[PDB]
Structure formats: C-alpha cells, structure tokens
Amino acid sequence: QTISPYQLKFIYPFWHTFFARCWCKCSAYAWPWVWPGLITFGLVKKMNHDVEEDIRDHYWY
Amino acid sequence: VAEDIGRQMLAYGRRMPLAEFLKRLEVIDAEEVKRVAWKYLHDAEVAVAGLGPLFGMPQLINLRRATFWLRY
Numbered sequence: 159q160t161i162s163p164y165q166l167k168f169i170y171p172f173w174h175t176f177f178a179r180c181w182c183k184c185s186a187y188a189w190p191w192v193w194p195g196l197i198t199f200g201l202v203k204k205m206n207h208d209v210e211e212d213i214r215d216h217y218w219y
Numbered sequence: 220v221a222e223d224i225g226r227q228m229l230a231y232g233r234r235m236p237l238a239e240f241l242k243r244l245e246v247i248d249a250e251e252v253k254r255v256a257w258k259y260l261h262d263a264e265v266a267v268a269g270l271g272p273l274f275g276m277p278q279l280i281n282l283r284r285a286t287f288w289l290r291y
C-alpha cells in the first residue's frame with residue numbers, strides 16, 4: 159500500500175523519528191571511527207612535543 | 220423499461236424522457252468535453268488496484284504525473 163505524496167505530511171515524519179535515527183547512526187560509528195581518531199590525535203601531539211624539544215637541544219646553548 | 224423508470228425515479232426524483240436526453244446530448248461539442256475534462260481530470264488524484272504478475276507495474280507517481288502533459 160502507498161499513499162500519494164500530495165496526501166502525506168513530509169517534513170514532520172523526519173523530525174518525529176530524529177532521535178532514534180541519530181542514536182543509531184552515532185552508536186554505530188563510535189568505536190570504528192573515533193577511537194583510532196583519538197589515538198592519531200595523540201600521536202600528533204606527542205610528535206609536536208618531540209620537535210619542540212629537539213629544536214632547543216640541537217641549536218640552543 | 221421498468222428498471223429504467225425506478226432507477227431514474229430514485230436518482231432524480233423523476234423520469235427523464237428520451238427527447239430531453241437527446242436534446243442535451245446533441246449540443247455537446249469538442250470544446251465542452253475539453254472544458255469538463257480540464258475541470259475534473261487534468262492534474263488529479265488517482266486510485267489503483269491490481270492482481271497478478273505485477274513486476275512490470277508502474278509506480279503510483281508515474282500514473283499521477285501522467286495526468287498532465289509537459290508538451291503544451
């Protein structure tokens with residue numbers, strides 16, 4: 159069964175089901191995308207540390 | 220004849236004689252048909268029912284957008 163789109167609400171059904179959809183999507187992506195992201199961000203910060211220490215060791219008296 | 224009498228009696232409150240039907244039918248021309256259709260059938264809603272090997276079947280939206288032509 160289908161109803162003609164001229165006889166349906168079409169922006170209320172999207173917001174009515176927003177929280178469920180958003181919970182599902184965000185739950186699905188946490189471990190696979192964010193945790194490696196956090197680790198990579200960590201690595202960048204530690205690299206910056208190493209460089210800012212090098213630049214003084216090598217060239218400051 | 221009896222069926223026609225009763226049917227018209229219920230539908231109209233009277234029976235319409237043959238001459239009246241013919242006289243009202245005579246004066247309809249093409250522009251009149253092309254007016255009434257434009258009044259009720261152009262760009263309207265449609266309802267659909269079907270049974271059987273309906274893999275071919277068109278979409279509802281196809282049948283509904285069919286009711287107008289983009290030519291003209």
Ligand SMILES: CCCCCCCCCCCCCCCCCC(=O)OC[C@H](COP(=O)([O-])OCC(O)COP(=O)([O-])OC[C@@H](COC(=O)CCCCCCCCCCCCCCCCC)OC(=O)CCCCCCCCCCCCCCCCC)OC(=O)CCCCCCCCCCCCCCCCC
Nearest residue numbers: 261262278279280281282283284285286287288289290291
């Ligand atoms: C870089 C270059 C890129 C170029 C890209 C060009 C893309 C254009 C695509 C053309 C449209 C699709 C055609 C498919 C038709 C299929 C065959 C068919 O059975 O159609 C029946 C259908 C007739 O309907 P029907 O059979 O009565 O029943 C319809 C159904 O009931 C109900 O209908 P339906 O539900 O079955 O859907 C039918 C649907 C079928 O389509 C589909 O189902 C798929 C969707 C179609 C494709 C949509 C994407 C196209 C993007 C459009 C924008 C392109 C801009 C490009 C500009 C380049 C810039 C660098 O057709 C449409 O509705 C198409 C409407 C759009 C076409 C009309 C555009 C012309 C406007 C001109 C204005 C004046 C401008 C002058 C200034 C110069 C501008 C350059 O035919 C059409 O109406 C189709 C269009 C016919 C063409 C008309 C004349 C075009 C010439 C325009 C002027 C040229 C200007 C150049 C001068 C330059 C001056 C410097």
